Structures are given as C-alpha cells and as structure tokens.
C-alpha cells in the first residue's frame, strides 16, 4: 500500500466515523475494559452474582404492573429498555455515515430494521468478559452464571451473546476498528425490501476499503483479521435468528412466569 489521496480519503473517512461513534456512544470499549480490569475510578460498579445481590443492587442502582414480577422478567425488561435506547444511539450514528441519508428513506429504515440487532450484539461484546456484562451504563455488572441460573426460557437468553463475545473479543478490536465495522453492517445491500441496492453497495465498498486499511494499520501482528471479521457477520445473522426465535417463545408465555409468584402465595396459604 502507498500514502496517496485515496489512502488519505479512507483515513479521513475512518477519523470521521470514530469521532461520530464517540458522540453517538457514551460507554465505549476503552471505557468498558477500564471498568472491567478495575483500572478505573469513574465508578466501581455493583456486582449482581445471586438473588441476594440482585435485590440489594436493584434498590441502589418501569411501569407499576411491570414493577412486581418474577426476577427473570424484571431483568428481561431492563434489556428491552436498553435495546430501545441502543436503537436511537445507532440511528444517531447511521446519520453521520457519508451517503446514508442521501438514499431512499424506506431503504434507510430497512437497513436499521435488520441492522440494529447485529450492532447491539457487536457492541454488547465490548461490555463483556468471561465473568459477565456491564449494565446501567457501567454502574452494575451481572454475572454470566447468575444470568444462566434464571428460570427457563430466560436462563438461555444471554448465553449465546457470551459465546459470540468470547470469540469476538479475542480479535482485540478497538473503538476505531468497531466504528467502521458497524457502518459496514448498517450498509448491507443483501437485505429484504430495498429499492436501490446499488448506492448502498457503493458506500459499503468504500467502508470495506476503509476497514481493510484500518485493520492493516491498526493490527500489524495478527492477519486474515479482515476475513475473520467478515466471517463474524455470519455468526451475527445466526445469533439474531436464535434471539428472535427465542423472543417468540417469550412473547407466547406472556404472563405465565409473572403469575407463578402469586399462585405460590395462594398455594402455601391453602
């Protein structure tokens, strides 16, 4: 590769996406890793490792009907809430990608329809180590084992995200890597119900060039890092499918899991 106006443009495009990513996302991976390795002071987050620490930490760290449920559904609702504010941050980030807004506004909504879920799993890995996950913008940390201990089907909810993350986090990407990767994902041309594929594919080819040069510059030691990273976009499609398939079984047994607390109370009296 050479220093030239083409290489310079791709660096300028990467700089633009980083700064825009730093503005769109309060809790970055650098911040996260700091809190996770205890070399922070911003905040020492509250650790939820059992039912005891759950309730001791819930007070200290939602509508009124949704207040009073099985511990499972209270936490799941914490993930529904976060998943809704995550979508706005990503929509904010999407806007700052050269060419994105200048497309069919129906194509934009489509690219974010299917995009958001993959980005959420991508950025979730940033908040994760082998022991658990940063929640409530880094103020808590819920353990993998506590999450796995929850009532079925909920106790299977986060476990694939952890498996993805371990593999993903071993690539050792930083916020400047992830910024371009995330923009590559959003401008996916092979997505359902798109009018003008071509201009989405054009932006993405430029983003893929930007990513390649980023990974070569930023990861001298590792290699086929570029290809390993495009393969992850497959592990993500499969994880999303499994998440949605799971959310079907969870939106089917709507309040069978929130009733059983009260059926137990009525049972003990009887």
UniProtKB/Swiss-Prot annotation:
Tissue specificity as recorded in UniProt: Highest expression in adipose tissue. Lower in skeletal muscle, spleen, heart and liver. Also detectable in placenta, lung and ovary.
Residues that bind rosiglitazone: 80-83, 117, 243, 267
Keywords: Activator, Biological rhythms, Cytoplasm, Diabetes mellitus, Disease variant, DNA-binding, Glycoprotein, Isopeptide bond, Metal-binding, Nucleus, Obesity, Phosphoprotein, Receptor, Transcription, Transcription regulation, Ubl conjugation, Zinc, Zinc-finger
Segments for region (Interaction with FAM120B): 2-51
Regulation: PDPK1 activates its transcriptional activity independently of its kinase activity.
UniProt motif (9aaTAD) ranges: 261-269
Effect ascribed to mutating residue 82 to H: In colon cancer; sporadic; somatic mutation; partial loss of ligand-binding
CC annotations in GO: chromatin; cytosol; intracellular membrane-bounded organelle; nucleoplasm; nucleus; receptor complex; RNA polymerase II transcription regulator complex
Annotated phenotype, changing residue 80 to P: In colon cancer; sporadic; somatic mutation; loss of ligand-binding
Coiled coil regions, renumbered to chain: none
Molecular-function GO terms, alphabetical: alpha-actinin binding; arachidonate binding; chromatin binding; DNA binding; DNA binding domain binding; DNA-binding transcription activator activity, RNA polymerase II-specific; DNA-binding transcription factor activity; DNA-binding transcription factor activity, RNA polymerase II-specific
Induction pattern: (Microbial infection) Expression increases when incubated with M.tuberculosis or its lipoprotein LpqH; induction is TLR2-dependent (at protein level).
Cross-link (Glycyl lysine isopeptide (Lys-Gly) (interchain with G-Cter in ubiquitin)): 23
Domain of life: Eukaryota
Post-translational modifications reported in the UniProt record: Phosphorylated in basal conditions and dephosphorylated when treated with the ligand. May be dephosphorylated by PPP5C. Ubiquitinated by E3 ubiquitin-protein ligase complex containing FBXO9; leading to proteasomal degradation. Ubiquitinated at Lys-23 by TRIM55 leading to proteasomal degradation. Ubiquitinated by E3 ubiquitin-protein ligase STUB1/CHIP; leading to proteasomal degradation.
Chief location of this protein within or outside the cell: nucleus
Outcome reported for the amino acid change (mutating residue 23 to R): More than 50% loss of ubiquitination
Location(s) in or outside the cell: Nucleus; Cytoplasm
Biological processes annotated in GO: BMP signaling pathway; cell differentiation; cell fate commitment; cell maturation; cellular response to hypoxia; cellular response to insulin stimulus; cellular response to low-density lipoprotein particle stimulus; epithelial cell differentiation
Domain NR LBD: 9-269
Family statement drawn from the similarity comment of this UniProt entry: Belongs to the nuclear hormone receptor family. NR1 subfamily.
Subunit composition and interactions: Interacts with FOXO1 (acetylated form). Heterodimer with other nuclear receptors, such as RXRA. The heterodimer with the retinoic acid receptor RXRA is called adipocyte-specific transcription factor ARF6. Interacts with NCOA6 coactivator, leading to a strong increase in transcription of target genes. Interacts with coactivator PPARBP, leading to a mild increase in transcription of target genes. Interacts with NOCA7 in a ligand-inducible manner. Interacts with NCOA1 and NCOA2 LXXLL motifs. Interacts with ASXL1, ASXL2, DNTTIP2, FAM120B, MAP2K1/MEK1, NR0B2, PDPK1, PRDM16, PRMT2 and TGFB1I1.
Disease: Defects in PPARG can lead to type 2 insulin-resistant diabetes and hyptertension. PPARG mutations may be associated with colon cancer. Obesity: A condition characterized by an increase of body weight beyond the limitation of skeletal and physical requirements, as the result of excessive accumulation of body fat.
Purpose of the protein: Nuclear receptor that binds peroxisome proliferators such as hypolipidemic drugs and fatty acids. Once activated by a ligand, the nuclear receptor binds to DNA specific PPAR response elements (PPRE) and modulates the transcription of its target genes, such as acyl-CoA oxidase. It therefore controls the peroxisomal beta-oxidation pathway of fatty acids. Key regulator of adipocyte differentiation and glucose homeostasis. ARF6 acts as a key regulator of the tissue-specific adipocyte P2 (aP2) enhancer. (Microbial infection) Upon treatment with M.tuberculosis or its lipoprotein LpqH, phosphorylation of MAPK p38 and IL-6 production are modulated, probably via this protein.
Record text about domains: The 9aaTAD motif is a transactivation domain present in a large number of yeast and animal transcription factors.
The protein's name: Peroxisome proliferator-activated receptor gamma
Lineage, uppermost ranks: Eukaryota, Metazoa, Chordata, Craniata, Vertebrata
